[PDB]
Amino acid sequence: GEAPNQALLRILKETEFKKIKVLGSGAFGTVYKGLWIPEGEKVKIPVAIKELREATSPKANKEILDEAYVMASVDNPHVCRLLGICLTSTVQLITQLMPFGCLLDYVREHKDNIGSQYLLNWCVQIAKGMNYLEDRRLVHRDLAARNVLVKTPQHVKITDFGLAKLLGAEEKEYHAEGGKVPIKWMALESILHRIYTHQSDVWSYGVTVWELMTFGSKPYDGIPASEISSILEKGERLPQPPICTIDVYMIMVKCWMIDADSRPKFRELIIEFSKMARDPQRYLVIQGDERMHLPSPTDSNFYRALMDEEDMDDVVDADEYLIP
Ligand SMILES: *CCC(=O)N1CC[C@H](Oc2cc3c(Nc4ccc(F)c(Cl)c4)ncnc3cc2OC)C1
């Protein structure tokens, strides 16, 4: 009827995780970083670990296992995959550590060193990730720069699958029902009718690109969420960022066309951003662009800036740690 999901869910013993330290908290719970040391492997894998405040809320463990299901079921260079889960007092999700954090904060904090080549390459990579998700019939529903993680400045991945929904062998629109929503990233048809498609995700991609090209500006700043549907129905859209040529901004605008099927496909966005990445200063205009650099794997205190030297001998990135 539909293809069997033969993803493996790995249950990981708590005794294999060390050096646990807080990255951030919310109402939801906590993310930590640590090392995962599968027993008698002589590997140490840098990981992030997501839990919730307590394993009492039924919804809580249900929501997080829904996220685990989606995250175990993906495998692509531009999407974050689940390494496994740890069943403790709480359900913890275990994934590859993305040491530079979320792209929203990253663009805000490093604007002075972010040139055109990185911006366009990120656009390409996010489009690849999104296209891969489409090929797997998944609709993310929460694409935003806060939901893209930075493995290295050269390599980003989409995460945060807690709102993602699959789509049946012959189904098109997810039709949701209630719960806090990222209004300022949503297609009109999603705000109005809780319709969600691969084409609604393209809308959010548009917004995400605007975030990057503005070095992390807040969309419709000061506009109350309750007013967004009206503004959009009037035909208002986010403004042309200063660095953007018309060529780039036009792509953004196409993502925000009322007719969902008039919007670009992820596969087209890959092509267009890829053409632009070959001549980046033709498409984005950044003062003093040519003279920027960000950290690259091949630098001295690239590995030392993360790692204790104690560990460094046997550290292995999750992308190089593969089981059958
Ligand atoms: C834009 C703000 C933001 O996203 N963060 C605030 C701090 C937190 O930092 C990191 C988070 C990660 C995660 N997150 C994650 C998401 C889903 C999931 F199922 C798991 Cl197990 C983990 N993943 C990897 N590396 C991270 C690195 C962070 O900061 C260094 C995100």
Author numbering: 696 to 1019
From the manuscript:
Surprisingly, the work identified a pair of enantiomers 16 and 17, with significantly different activities. The crystal structures clearly showed the formation of a covalent bond in the potent S-enantiomer 17, which was not observed for the R-enantiomer 16.
Intact protein mass spectrometry analysis was carried out on all acrylamide analogues (see SI) and pleasingly, all demonstrated formation of a covalent adduct with WT EGFR with a single binding event. Around a two-fold increase in the level of protein modification by S-pyrrolidine 17 compared to the less potent R-enantiomer 16 was observed, which is consistent with the measured EGFR potencies in the TR FRET assay. In cellular EGFR phosphorylation, the more potent S-enantiomer 17 showed increased inhibition by more than an order of magnitude (pIC50 > 8.0 compared to 7.1) in WT EGFR overexpressing A431 cell lines. The difference in potency was also apparent in DM expressing H1975 cells. This difference further translated into growth effects in A431 cells, with 17 demonstrating a pGI50 of 8.1 compared to 6.5 for less potent R-enantiomer 16. The carbon-sulphur bond between 17 and Cys797 in WT EGFR demonstrates a bond length of 1.79 Å and bond angle 113˚. To further assess the impact of the chiral centre on covalency, kinetic characterisation for binding of 16 and 17 against WT EGFR was carried out. This showed the same difference in binding affinity with more potent 17 showing a 6-fold lower KI and 3-fold faster kinact relative to 16. These indicated that the EGFR-bound conformation of 17 was also the lowest energy unbound conformation, whilst for 16, the non-covalent bound conformation seen in the crystal structure was significantly more favourable than the covalently bound conformation generated in the docking studies.
